[PDB]
Design a protein around this motif. Structure first.
Motif, short mmCIF file in Angstrom:
data_model
loop_
_atom_site.label_atom_id
_atom_site.label_comp_id
_atom_site.label_asym_id
_atom_site.label_seq_id
_atom_site.Cartn_x
_atom_site.Cartn_y
_atom_site.Cartn_z
N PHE A 1 0.83 -1.20 0.00
CA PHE A 1 0.00 0.00 0.00
C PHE A 1 0.87 1.25 0.00
N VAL A 2 1.95 1.19 0.76
CA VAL A 2 2.93 2.25 0.76
C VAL A 2 3.54 2.49 -0.63
N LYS A 3 3.89 1.42 -1.34
CA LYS A 3 4.41 1.57 -2.70
C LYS A 3 3.32 2.13 -3.60
N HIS A 4 2.08 1.78 -3.28
CA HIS A 4 0.93 2.19 -4.08
C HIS A 4 0.67 3.70 -3.96
N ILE A 5 0.86 4.25 -2.77
CA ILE A 5 0.77 5.69 -2.60
C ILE A 5 1.79 6.38 -3.51
N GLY A 6 3.02 5.88 -3.51
CA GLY A 6 4.02 6.42 -4.41
C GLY A 6 3.59 6.45 -5.86
N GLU A 7 2.81 5.45 -6.28
CA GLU A 7 2.37 5.41 -7.66
C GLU A 7 1.22 6.37 -7.93
N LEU A 8 0.30 6.49 -6.97
CA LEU A 8 -0.83 7.41 -7.11
C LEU A 8 -0.34 8.86 -7.22
N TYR A 9 0.78 9.16 -6.56
CA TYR A 9 1.40 10.48 -6.65
C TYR A 9 2.13 10.71 -7.97
N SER A 10 2.56 9.63 -8.61
CA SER A 10 3.42 9.75 -9.78
C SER A 10 2.66 10.33 -10.98
#
Length: 284
Positions: free
Chosen positions: A9-18
């Motif tokens: 989920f943490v990696k997923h936040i990084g992607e949603l921001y990208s």
């Protein structure tokens, strides 16, 4: 439903921001559409005798999840309040989400709290913000006040840097019960709080105050959709995190969107939810 482990989920936040936050926009638009064809009705909110009971003419309470007041002798709509049951984590109707009360709805407001066996109030708004009236003061500035048959007495006030806590006792005239109000005081006029820490502290403490096994926690802001929803999502997901070490913001949010209109009203609030969950996960 599709719970993801904290790590993913943490990696997923990084992607949603990208890509200029492209994923947040994509998610929020999904959320904004997800009930559009469900013809979910709100006939009571629209019925003319209940017009003055609504803070915003366009912010409604779905009929199927609305909190009903017990009927009263004399009007037939004496049962209506702009309020909705909303699910929390692993517990249906963990919250009542409602607008900030109008002076005309003060009695209805406390009678709901009485009739629902509510012990915790969460208020995520100041009475006025940036010149504009957001909520009316439904509690006595000091001592006691009477709202229909419920008399509300202020017993204590603790002021903290970012929020205040007030202990009331309420008695029905047909002190008997304790209602504690957690009132977040440092929310900005425009947009969402720059630092999630103060809000995470407010969420955790107002959540733990929830004693077993009592009525739903009442959460309101102004219209009871934006900040109210933001609080409900963050609270539920913290609890899922403690419990399963999984998170699912989008699926939970799409769900509760069936229970009240506009819960988490803006993309900015939706992004905030993720920043807040990230800080909590990076902490303990």
């Amino acid at each position: 439903m599709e719970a993801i482990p904290v790590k993913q989920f943490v990696k997923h936040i990084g992607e949603l921001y990208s890509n200029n936050q492209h994923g947040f926009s994509e998610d929020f638009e999904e959320v904004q559409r997800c009930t559009a064809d469900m013809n979910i009705t709100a006939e009571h909110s629209n019925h003319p005798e209940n017009k003055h009971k609504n803070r915003y003419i366009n912010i409604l309470a779905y009929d199927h999840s609305r909190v009903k007041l017990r009927p009263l002798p004399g009007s037939k709509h004496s049962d209506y309040i702009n309020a909705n049951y909303v699910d929390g984590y692993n517990k249906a109707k963990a919250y009542i989400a409602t607008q900030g009360p109008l002076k005309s709805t003060f009695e209805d407001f406390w009678r709901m709290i009485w009739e629902q066996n509510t012990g915790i109030i969460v208020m995520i708004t100041n009475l006025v913000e940036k010149g504009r009236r957001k909520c009316d003061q439904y509690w006595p500035t000091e001592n006691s006040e009477e709202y229909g048959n419920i008399i509300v007495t202020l017993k204590s006030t603790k002021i903290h840097a970012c929020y205040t806590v007030r202990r009331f006792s309420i008695r029905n005239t047909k002190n008997e019960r304790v209602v504690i109000q957690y009132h977040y005081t440092q929310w900005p006029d425009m947009g969402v709080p720059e630092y999630a820490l103060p809000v995470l502290t407010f969420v955790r403490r107002s959540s733990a105050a929830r004693m077993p096994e009592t009525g739903p926690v009442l959460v309101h802001c102004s219209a009871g959709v934006g900040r109210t929803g933001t609080y409900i999502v963050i609270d539920s997901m913290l609890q899922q995190i403690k419990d399963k070490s999984t998170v699912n913001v989008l699926g939970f949010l799409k769900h509760i969107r069936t229970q009240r209109n506009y819960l988490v009203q803006t993309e900015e609030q939706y992004i905030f939810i993720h920043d807040a969950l990230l800080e909590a996960i990076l902490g303990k």
